[PDB]
Structure 1
Amino acid sequence: TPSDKPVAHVVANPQAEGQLQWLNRRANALLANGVELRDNQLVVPSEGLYLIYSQVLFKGQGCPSTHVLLTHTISRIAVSYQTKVNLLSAIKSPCQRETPAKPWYEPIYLGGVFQLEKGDRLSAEINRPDYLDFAESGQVYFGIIAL
């Protein structure tokens, strides 16, 4: 007997270099029990507590002249207040000292439990899609699990 628990696990489209497009129409990606993926956002089918999680992986070849700041943020767009409200956020400075060139890898993980309402849209965005590494699978993803 399958679970009736709203769950989703969507992955970065590896073809869309220079963008962060979430896919459920990809191997080992899913939407279950009412969760929808609409306009790059997960739509919550019913109210309740949910675990929200996401990982992005950033990669760079050395350290450039201008300082790099990498951000990943998970936003909620409620039906009654249709503006992005941050739930989870994290910032990283991959290069402490600039190159006076070794590849660096910086994962950003976000996860937490939030009360969500029916129709809430969830966004998961980065500031630098040009640094995102999603060629190999399993590195960039975004999911929910209803408690």
Structure 2
Amino acid sequence: TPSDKPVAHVVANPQAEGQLQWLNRRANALLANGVELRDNQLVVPSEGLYLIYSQVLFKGQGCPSTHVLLTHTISRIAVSYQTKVNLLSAIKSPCQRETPAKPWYEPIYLGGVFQLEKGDRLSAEINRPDYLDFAESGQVYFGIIAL
């Protein structure tokens, strides 16, 4: 008998270069037991503890003049407070200095366990989609597992 636990693993659309579009319709991506992907946001079907997790990968060929600051954030939009509450966040400076030009790879991973309500809208956002790496699949994903 299949599991009744809400789950979801959405992935970046690799053709949507310049955005971070989460897909559920894509091979090895998934929504189940009530979880929805609406408006680039996961929608929690029922209260409980969820494991939330996301990976994003950044890439640049060399370091430019302006300082590069990469951020990744999992936000929450509750029905009783319909403004983004940050759940998880992290920030990486992949460049110490400007190149006087080998390629760099900055992943950002966020995971934790949080209490969610029914109708919670979860988003996972980055500041610089132009540095996202869609070179092969599996690298950029966002997902939840009810515990």
Identity %: 100
Give the root-mean-square deviation of aligned CA atoms.
Answer: 0.5
Q: Determine the C-alpha separation between the residues in 1 that align with 2:20 and 2:13.
A: 7
Runs of 5+ consecutive residues of structure 2 not aligned to the other structure: none
Q: Secondary structure at the match of 1:130?
A: helix
> Which segment drifts farther, 117-126 or 127-136?
127-136
Runs of 5+ consecutive residues of structure 1 not aligned to the other structure: none
Shift of 1:80: 0.6
Map 1:1-147 → 2, pairs under 5 A = 1-147=1-147
Shift of 1:10: 0.2
Shift of 1:117: 0.1
TM-superposition CA deviations, 1:54-83 (whole Å, max 9, x none): 000000000000000000000000001000
TM-superposition CA deviations, 1:23-51 (whole Å, max 9, x none): 00000000000000000000000000000
Per the normalisation by structure 1, the TM-score is 0.99
Shift of 1:97: 1.9
Q: Determine the C-alpha separation between the residues in 2 that align with 1:121 and 1:51.
A: 15
Q: Determine the C-alpha separation between the residues in 2 that align with 1:35 and 1:19.
A: 23
Moved beyond 2 Å, runs of 4+: none
Shift of 1:135: 3.0
Q: Determine the C-alpha separation between the residues in 2 that align with 1:110 and 1:23.
A: 19
TM-superposition CA deviations, 1:70-112 (whole Å, max 9, x none): 0000000000100001000000000112211110000000000
Q: Determine the C-alpha separation between the residues in 1 that align with 2:44 and 2:96.
A: 39
Q: Determine the C-alpha separation between the residues in 2 that align with 1:135 and 1:93.
A: 21
TM-superposition CA deviations, 1:100-134 (whole Å, max 9, x none): 11100000000000000000000000000000002
